[PDB]
Design a protein around this ligand. Sequence first.
Ligand SMILES: C[C@]1(c2cccc(-c3cccnc3)c2)NC(N)=C(c2ccccc2)N1
Length: 375
Amino acid sequence: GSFVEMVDNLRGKSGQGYYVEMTVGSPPQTLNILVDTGSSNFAVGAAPHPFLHRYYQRQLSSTYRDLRKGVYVPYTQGKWEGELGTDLVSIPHGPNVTVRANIAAITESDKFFINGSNWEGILGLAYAEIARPDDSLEPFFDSLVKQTHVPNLFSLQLCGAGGSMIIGGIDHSLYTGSLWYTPIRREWYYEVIIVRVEINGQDLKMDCKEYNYDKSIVDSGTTNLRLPKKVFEAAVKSIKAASSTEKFPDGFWLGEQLVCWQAGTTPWNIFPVISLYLMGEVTNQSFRITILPQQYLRPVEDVATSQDDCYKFAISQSSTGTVMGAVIMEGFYVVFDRARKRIGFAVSACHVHDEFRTAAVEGPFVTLDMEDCGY
Ligand SMILES: C[C@]1(c2cccc(-c3cccnc3)c2)NC(N)=C(c2ccccc2)N1
């Protein structure tokens, strides 16, 4: 099971995340699992629920071992309660291996499972520092590297309208041009540093620590580009100014309401490009990733609205720092090089573009009067 067989192993409908097929237990029970770089638990629905098509049945697995420890994970609004154990885990369209890993068997949940997402669990790919109940609960990826010869690296190619998760290597057929690396600041979330933000090449002209208040992360489990209050307001002001030929409700800018245009007439040209400059591997060198409106204006698939093309503004205000979500990752080949504590970005085969503009990864960029951009 090489990278060739790993290509196109991801699915997922707009705004509901990307999932990979996995097996838990012996005989293997097949489930769809959300690929999440923003969390560190492997947590699977293990009891019936209105939104679950299937769930993990521990009584049917002869390899299951109960850890006699509970886990309670509350979020902003949603939450899940579970029971810890271990069992045999495999990724049928990933590395040709089966490992023993920690599993949080979800017995109760509230606003966690999404109606029609098609996933029954979450694969948290981030570090042990943020694992629940504590850092002593070894994440799946750490177990995989420990128990197999798989190199300490994975890559994500998320595509808009599926994609690929490549474990253990870089698949050179999934990207064009250069791979540019940003250092992983701290191993907890995939924490990175944004050194500059431009909107249609116009610098937001803020102290770069503002872009990373209190952290900046690469999160496949978050849909939007989430921005700290001060940065979000200036980005919205710039986007509204550039798109002034059309006026949208306040609701649109709050990411709550749809903006629709008759099929094939979306005025892409009126919306600006967002450039996120990421800290390079060498002092005061950086590179940028360019985000087109085809990424930040997320299409909302609905048969009832299908005579038009409708979208949600996929940029939102955050109080927990910058979040480079799925809309940001889409179109790029993102390398999570845990072995070298770095994240690589390159233009992917499924990048967004039109006749005038294209998603890009460019560098190097030099700054001479640069402070440290982190908090
Ligand atoms: C656990 C979950 C999560 C749990 C359940 C569903 C999702 C989800 C929802 C919509 C699309 N994709 C994934 C995410 N995964 C991630 N990354 C977050 C998170 C959100 C904001 C900041 C930091 C972390 N929440």
